[PDB]
């Protein structure tokens, strides 16, 4: 359940990894393949739910789902597609979820609220390439929506050329809630760069190390699994560099496999994580 790789050994176990056509790399990424794989996910699966599901194969394991509170006519009203996700410190730090679909984003609104989320971030276009990735769920501009009970206003939003940040107010109390809208990941395969997505991470965990009150951090991509995984897997990790001898990138995805199917969805990623952390380890070396 886990591989911890002192920091001075990491360059070379990872070359290691790579050598005959990535062939122990492979092994260990497969060693992965089955974890969590004893878990239900039937409340996914009831008829009443069918329609709140992006993708039908994608659901949330029935031990760490989200619920959303419900009391007077709750057929399954408490059901949302999202899942806890523990971190480097304690369990439930993220969210994991989905892209809102536009049927269930007043519930996506409405767990925000429930559980205190100060900050969601997001890791997807809302349409790629012409292929629908995840309802433009937030308003287009300063004008007020209502997403079911709740009211929002968009107070800010700032554009740089790799993400979207913006603020958004929430009536139900008012609570200020900072949207990370990472807006270059590739339609195929990774970042062309390590450094865009460790400097994406470094300043989400800024902002989330600035939240003390707030529950968890929201994260989410089309299904909720490959970008988000990746996204967690390395908000992690380099937590453990700053403040730890060694570094489990392997213990870090098997924590994930637990709490949601598929997190880190693709070899492909897994190996950007290790490219990740060698691009980090080489600069402080230095
Ligand atoms: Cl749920
Ligand atoms: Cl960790």
Known sequence: ??????????????????????????KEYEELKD??????????????????????????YDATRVKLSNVDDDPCSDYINASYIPGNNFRREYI?????????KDDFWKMVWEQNVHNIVMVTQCVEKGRVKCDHYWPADQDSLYYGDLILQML?????????????????????IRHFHYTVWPDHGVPETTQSLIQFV?????????????????????????????????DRILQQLDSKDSVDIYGAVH????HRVHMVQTECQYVYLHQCVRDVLRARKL
């Open 1 to 26: 359940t886990s591989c911890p790789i002192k920091i001075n050994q990491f360059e070379g176990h990872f070359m290691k990894l790579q050598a005959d056509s990535n062939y122990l790399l492979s």
């Open 35 to 60: 974890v969590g794989r004893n878990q239900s996910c039937d409340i996914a699966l009831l008829p009443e739910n069918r329609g709140k599901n992006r993708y039908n194969n994608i659901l949330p």
């Open 96 to 104: 994991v979820t989905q892209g809102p679909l536009p049927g269930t």
């Open 156 to 176: 800010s939003e700032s554009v740089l050329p790799e993400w979207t940040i913006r603020e958004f107010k929430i009536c139900g109390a008012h609570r200020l």
């Open 202 to 234: 470094r300043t989400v965990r800024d902002y989330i190390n600035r939240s003390p009150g707030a529950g968890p951090t929201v994260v989410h991509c089309s299904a909720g699994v490959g970008r988000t995984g990746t996204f967690i897997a390395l």
């Open 255 to 258: 924590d994930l496999r637990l």
